[PDB]
Amino acid sequence: STGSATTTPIDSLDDAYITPVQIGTPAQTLNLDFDTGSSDLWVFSSETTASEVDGQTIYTPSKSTTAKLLSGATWSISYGDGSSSSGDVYTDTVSVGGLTVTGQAVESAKKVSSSFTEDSTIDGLLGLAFSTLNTVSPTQQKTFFDNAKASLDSPVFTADLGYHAPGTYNFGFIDTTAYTGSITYTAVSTKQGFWEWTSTGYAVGSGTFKSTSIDGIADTGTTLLYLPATVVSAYWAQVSGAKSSSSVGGYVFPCSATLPSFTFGVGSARIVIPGDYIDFGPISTGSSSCFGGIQSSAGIGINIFGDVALKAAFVVFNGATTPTLGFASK
Fold it and tell me: Which domain holds residue 28?
């Protein structure tokens, strides 16, 4: 089997991407944030504290003839950005772009933190990291991909995120028309439950490539590119007027600037992030100071190849016995 679904930016800045997901019988379609950095499929629901729902579409398990309460199961997750959610668990039928999994754990939110409430466009998350990170207790549950894997034509999914445009998540096949050149595969460590890999270096603009190992995770659920302070300083030094602002919480730059590209290495291959991808617009409405899309990972504990990096590539998440990651230009 295979599946293919379009993923769409939630706003003009590509702050996140949403993908429609069918849950239950008859289908209830929710728009979920596919997140290769976490492993829970959770949704706003009829059980979510009323004051914490503001415009989201909800899953109502009582209206699904295939929903079954998973007895005694609860979940609770805290994300790297400080947001969180928790609740109980159903199993139900879940379909993505024509690919169907029966008995998928659907984690129904009873509580969500303010950032989720305040974002009306995201109805929940679909985690695509390794199932070892799943938070369901006392019996850990499998991700949608893990459940689907055996049925897939090939045990892979691909992320093809657009810049200010829709893109695609495919399951079970590689669309050879979706990228240019070849896909370069690179080793993955699953020790932390992430798609963790090691970039071979970077360049800023037309500058010379610096060969250096940068360990980080491929994370579709993180907006920006978080890299070591040395690398980030080298990038912003090429932008007149750019500065790290403690009050704003990262590097900012004059909105009148033209940003240089940023290149990262995948083996001997190179992925070029155009400068425009690194512009996240005014820090506050009407300001002429803009927020940078490349930020320091220093206070995170891990480097994160988030959407800023991933949307410059066609990315293969290879879930073979020994997982690997593939990157192609596009």
Answer: 5-174
